[PDB]
Amino acid sequence: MKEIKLILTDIDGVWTDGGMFYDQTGNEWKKFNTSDSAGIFWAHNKGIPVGILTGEKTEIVRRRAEKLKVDYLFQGVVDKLSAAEELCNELGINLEQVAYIGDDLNDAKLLKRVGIAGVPASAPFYIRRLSTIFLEKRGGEGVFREFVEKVLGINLEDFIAVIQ
Amino acid sequence: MKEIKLILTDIDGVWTDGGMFYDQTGNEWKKFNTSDSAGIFWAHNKGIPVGILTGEKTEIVRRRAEKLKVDYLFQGVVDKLSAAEELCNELGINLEQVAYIGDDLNDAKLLKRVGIAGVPASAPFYIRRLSTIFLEKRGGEGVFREFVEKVLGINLEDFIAVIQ
Amino acid sequence: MKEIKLILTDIDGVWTDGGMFYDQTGNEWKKFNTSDSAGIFWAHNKGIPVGILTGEKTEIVRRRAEKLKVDYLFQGVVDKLSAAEELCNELGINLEQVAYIGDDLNDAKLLKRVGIAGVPASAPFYIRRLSTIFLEKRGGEGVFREFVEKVLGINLEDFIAVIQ
Amino acid sequence: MKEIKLILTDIDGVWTDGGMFYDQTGNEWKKFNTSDSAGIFWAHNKGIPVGILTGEKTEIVRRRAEKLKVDYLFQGVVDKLSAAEELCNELGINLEQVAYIGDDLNDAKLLKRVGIAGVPASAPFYIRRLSTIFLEKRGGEGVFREFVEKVLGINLEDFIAVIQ
Ligand SMILES: [Cl-]
Ligand SMILES: [Cl-]
Ligand SMILES: [Cl-]
Ligand SMILES: [Cl-]
Ligand SMILES: [Cl-]
Ligand SMILES: [Mg+2]
Ligand SMILES: [Mg+2]
Ligand SMILES: [Mg+2]
Ligand SMILES: [Mg+2]
């Protein structure tokens, strides 16, 4: 896999199965999968930061990002490509050096520009054919972890080294 | 596909898997799928309004409808066919120009009268027989999106046009 | 099908997938499926009462039973066979005239004594082999509805008559 | 099977599908499966204590451990192997007399040292290959029950004895 300086990810439909839980009082939930915490683990193990880009804006996601020590969080993003370009500029890198995973229409422009594009198996067909690697997992099933492990070429030897 | 002037939809079992979450305090939840927001996107892209018909009446659904900018919301509806007919009268269209998706007994009368009837794959067989197009997805899996994309003939060219 | 005068049902693992949601504050949730409301519909259409027997005791279930107009509710039940006997004795009913659906160890004694025993496809093997009819559905997927429809012989003629 | 004196288990990804539900207010949920309560039942029927080891630390899990009468609860565990070793010392047993089920990186060292290692079908490949018995079930689907029933050789005769 090519040199990656930054891993970027959408939330809904990647870190979740797209589920948005509403109650009667104005509260909202998302269901994350702890498996995806290993995606952050491996990225940080390899010295690579992770950022979240989302068009939603919730305290749900601020708290999850905090729990997992995610390096960057941008919410209420209207243009994910622009947001990614701004973060690349912030860090002194280019989009070819970015791996991005997303699942829907508002991810497409960014997916087409990054060094490595990932799309979960659960995403719409139009979006899946933008993926530059095959991801078997669906949103919420640990597909962010799957993406990171493929992008970084994590193998049995890496595993053996971290469980010493 | 027939000329459609209005898309109507049930909620529970279409926008959800039928799940109704109850706690100990009288609160209630539903789990929506963000994928279904694209059904509204495509309808509005084609200049078609969307209405929700539901026999339930919840702040859950009021809030979800307003998040997605749904054009019409009728809750506490005991007679979905008559609600659809009244909206058709208001809009100056007929039921043959309506696409409706529903999943259960109280949807049947309306399903039999519309121009295009959709039923999720998870619905009872005697309701599925009423569908006039095949839907692969189950309730809560993005079947409202699936329905809209089929009804409106959304294709790769439409996709390419919206992503710049 | 043999004469059934009462339908009895467990909750967890039948009306749900066994899920028990806990938060940080002492609240609890269950996820019901609206499909199962049709089981009450068909029972009542045929003049048959429904009772719930559960070893748990929650406001969750009290509220669900009330909305669905369930005829009898017994919570905190230590011995489901005894509870069924005592209800049936009040009503004049023999266990051979009862259909009961349950999923786990504390259901077995009653399942072995009723006229029609149902067990969801998701239940443990030792319990499934007690079922006297095959149920395809899993807990929380509408298996109470499936059971009722099979028990009462609900057919296309019934459907046609209710949706005219 | 091997003689087992202690059953140990992780929570997230074993007793759950890995789901971690976050709301807007700082609360958190897990979804347990009631089927897993039979794992405690069978362990206690055979006179074997059960302990939980988890790196998380929540009121959610305090409550579940209480409901199920779990013998030992260790949360915020930094090193699961060390925690198991210390508990074994207290009990005067060795790791070869322990059955442990876990699903992820921080379970690997302990899985490699116990007498019977179990890993759910949903776990990462690198962890599944450490399992010494095959488990069909995924996290949250009753895999703790499956593990206990296999480890203790529960059979139809055992079932018949408990439902008298
Ligand atoms: Cl978004
Ligand atoms: Cl859920
Ligand atoms: Cl309804
Ligand atoms: Cl019970
Ligand atoms: Cl852990
Ligand atoms: Mg998304
Ligand atoms: Mg419905
Ligand atoms: Mg049960
Ligand atoms: Mg775990």
From Swiss-Prot, chains A, B, C, D:
Family (UniProt): Belongs to the KdsC family.
CDD domains: HAD_KDO-like
InterPro entries registered for this protein in UniProt: CMP-NeuNAc_synthase, HAD-like_sf, HAD-SF_hydro_IIIA, HAD_sf, KdsC_fam
Subunit structure: Homotetramer.
Binding positions for substrate per the UniProt entry: 34, 54-56, 64-67, 80, 106
Cofactor: Mg(2+)
Keywords attached to this entry: Hydrolase, Magnesium, Metal-binding
Protein species of origin: Bacteroides thetaiotaomicron (strain ATCC 29148 / DSM 2079 / JCM 5827 / CCUG 10774 / NCTC 10582 / VPI-5482 / E50)
Name of the protein: 2-keto-3-deoxy-D-glycero-D-galacto-9-phosphonononic acid phosphatase
Coiled-coil region list: none
